Structure 1
Amino acid sequence: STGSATTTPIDSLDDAYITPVQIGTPAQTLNLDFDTGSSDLWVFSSETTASEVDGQTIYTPSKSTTAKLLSGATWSISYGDGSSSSGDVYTDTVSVGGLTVTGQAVESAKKVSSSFTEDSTIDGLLGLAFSTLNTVSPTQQKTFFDNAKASLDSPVFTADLGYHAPGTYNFGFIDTTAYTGSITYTAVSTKQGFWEWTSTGYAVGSGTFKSTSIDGIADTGTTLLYLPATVVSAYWAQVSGAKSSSSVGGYVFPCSATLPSFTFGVGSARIVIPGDYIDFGPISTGSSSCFGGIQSSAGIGINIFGDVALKAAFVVFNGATTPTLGFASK
């Protein structure tokens, strides 16, 4: 089997991408944030504290003839941005782009943190990291991909995120018309539960490529590119007037600037992020100070190849017995 679904930016900055997901019978379609940095499929629901729902579409398990309470199971998650959610668990039928999993754990939120409430466009998350990170207790549950992978034509999914435009998540096949050149595959460590890999270096604009190993994660659920402070300083030094602002929370730059590209290495291959992809717009409405799309990971503990980097590539998440990642230009 295969599936293919369009993923759509939630706003004009590409802050996140939503993908329609069918849950239950009859289908209830929710727009979920596919997140290769986490491993829970959780949704706003009829159980979510009413004051914490503000415009999201909810899953109502009582209206699904295939929903079953997973007795005794609870979940609770905290993300790298400080947001969180928790609740109980149903199993139900879940379909993405024509690919159906029966008995998928659907984690129903009883509580969500304010950042989720305040984002009416995201009805939940669909985790695509390794199932070892799933938070369901006392019996950990499998991700959608883990449940589907034996049925898929090939045990892979691909992320083709758009710049200011829709893109595609495919399951079970590699669309050879969706990229240029060849796909370069690189090793993955699953020891932390992430799609963790090592970039071979970077370049700023037309500058020389610096060969240096940069360990990080491929994370579709993180907006920006978070890299070591040395790398980030080298980038922003090429933007007149750019500076790190402790009050804003990162590098800002004059909105009048033209940003240079940023290149990262995948083996001997190179992925070029155009300068425009690094512009996240005014820090507040009407400001001439703009927020940068490349930020320091120093306070995180891990480097993160988020959407800024991934949207410049066609990305293969190869879930073979020994997982690997593939990157192609497009």
Structure 2
Amino acid sequence: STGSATTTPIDSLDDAYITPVQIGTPAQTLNLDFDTGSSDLWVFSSETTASEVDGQTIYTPSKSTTAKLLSGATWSISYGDGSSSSGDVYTDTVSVGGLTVTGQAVESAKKVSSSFTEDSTIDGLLGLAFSTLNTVSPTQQKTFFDNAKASLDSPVFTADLGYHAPGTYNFGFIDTTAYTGSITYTAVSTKQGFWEWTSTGYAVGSGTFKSTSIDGIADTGTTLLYLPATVVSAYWAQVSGAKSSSSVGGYVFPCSATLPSFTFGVGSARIVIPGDYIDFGPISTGSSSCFGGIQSSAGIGINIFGDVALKAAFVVFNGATTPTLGFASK
């Protein structure tokens, strides 16, 4: 089997992407944030504290003939941006782009933090990291991909995120028409539960490529590119008027600036992030200062290849017995 679903930016900055997911019988379609940096599939629901729901579409398990309560089970997650959610657990039938998993754990939110409430466009998350990060207790549950794997034509999914445009998540096949040139594959460590790999270096604009190992994670659920302070300083030093602002919370630059591209290494191959992808717009409405899309990872404890980087590539998440990552230009 295979599946193919379109993923759509939630706003004009590509802050996140939502993908329609069919849950239950008859189908309830919710727009979820596919997150390769976490491993829980959780949804706003009929159980979510009413005051914490503001415009989201909710899953109502009592209206699904295939929903089953996982007796005694609970879940609780905290994300890197400080947001969080928690609740109880159902299994139900879940379909993505035509691919169906029966008995998928669907984590029903009883409580969500303010940033989730305040985002009316995201109805929940669908985790695509390794199932070792799943937060269900007492017994951890498998991700959608883990459950689907044995049914898939090939044990892979691909992320093809758009710049200011829709893109695609495919399951079980590689669309050879979706990229230019060849896919370069690189090793993955699952030791921390992430799609963790080592970039071979970087270049700033037309500068010569610097060969240096940068360990990080491929994370579709993170908006920006977070890299070591050395690398980030080298980038913003090439932008007139750019500076790190502790009050704003990162590098800012004159909105009138022309941003250089940023290149990262995948083995001997290279992915070029155009300068425009690095512009995340005015720091506040009407400001002539803009927020940068490449920021320091110092204090995160990990480098994150988020959407700014991934949307410049066609990305293969190869869940074979020994997982790998593949990157192509497009």
- 1:127 deviates by 0.1
Report Cα offsets for 1:240-271 as digits up to 9, x if no partner. 00000000000000001010000000000000
Q: Give the aligned length.
A: 330
Report Cα offsets for 1:188-235 as digits up to 9, x if no partner. 000000000000000000000000000000000000000000000000
| Matching residue of 2:73 | 73
Identity of aligned residues (%): 100
| Correspondences of 1:152-171 after superposition (within 5 Å) | 152-171=152-171
- TM-score under structure 2 length normalisation: 1.00
| Matching residue of 1:64 | 64
Report the Cα distance in structure 2 between the residues aligned to 1:209 and 1:321, rounded to whole angstroms.
33
Report the Cα distance in structure 2 between the residues aligned to 1:73 and 1:185, rounded to whole angstroms.
38
Report the Cα distance in structure 2 between the residues aligned to 1:7 and 1:162, rounded to whole angstroms.
8
| Matching residue of 1:321 | 321
Give the secondary structure class of the aligned counterpart of 1:150: helix
Give the secondary structure class of the aligned counterpart of 2:13: coil
Report Cα offsets for 1:40-97 as digits up to 9, x if no partner. 0000000000000000000000000000000000000000000000000000000000
Give the secondary structure class of the aligned counterpart of 2:26: coil
- 1:117 deviates by 0.2
- 1:159 deviates by 0.1
Report the Cα distance in structure 1 between the residues aligned to 2:144 and 2:325, rounded to whole angstroms.
18
Report the Cα distance in structure 2 between the residues aligned to 1:117 and 1:235, rounded to whole angstroms.
35
Is 1:105–2:105 an aligned residue pair?
yes
Report the Cα distance in structure 2 between the residues aligned to 1:178 and 1:130, rounded to whole angstroms.
25
Misfit runs of 4+, over 4 Å: none
- 1:149 deviates by 0.2
Report Cα offsets for 1:175-195 as digits up to 9, x if no partner. 000000000000000000000
Report the Cα distance in structure 1 between the residues aligned to 2:120 and 2:211, rounded to whole angstroms.
42
Report the Cα distance in structure 1 between the residues aligned to 2:34 and 2:288, rounded to whole angstroms.
32
Give the secondary structure class of the aligned counterpart of 1:285: coil
Report the Cα distance in structure 2 between the residues aligned to 1:137 and 1:145, rounded to whole angstroms.
20
Give the secondary structure class of the aligned counterpart of 1:149: helix
Give the secondary structure class of the aligned counterpart of 1:231: helix
Report the Cα distance in structure 2 between the residues aligned to 1:250 and 1:264, rounded to whole angstroms.
21
- 1:238 deviates by 0.3
Report the Cα distance in structure 2 between the residues aligned to 1:322 and 1:288, rounded to whole angstroms.
48
Calculate the aligned-residue CA RMSD, in Å: 0.2
What stretches of structure 1 of length at least 5 have no aligned partner?
Answer: none
Report the Cα distance in structure 1 between the residues aligned to 2:249 and 2:63, rounded to whole angstroms.
44
Give the secondary structure class of the aligned counterpart of 2:234: helix
Report Cα offsets for 1:291-324 as digits up to 9, x if no partner. 0000000010000000000000000000000000
| Matching residue of 1:242 | 242
- TM-score under structure 1 length normalisation: 1.00
Give the secondary structure class of the aligned counterpart of 2:320: coil
Report the Cα distance in structure 2 between the residues aligned to 1:160 and 1:119, rounded to whole angstroms.
23
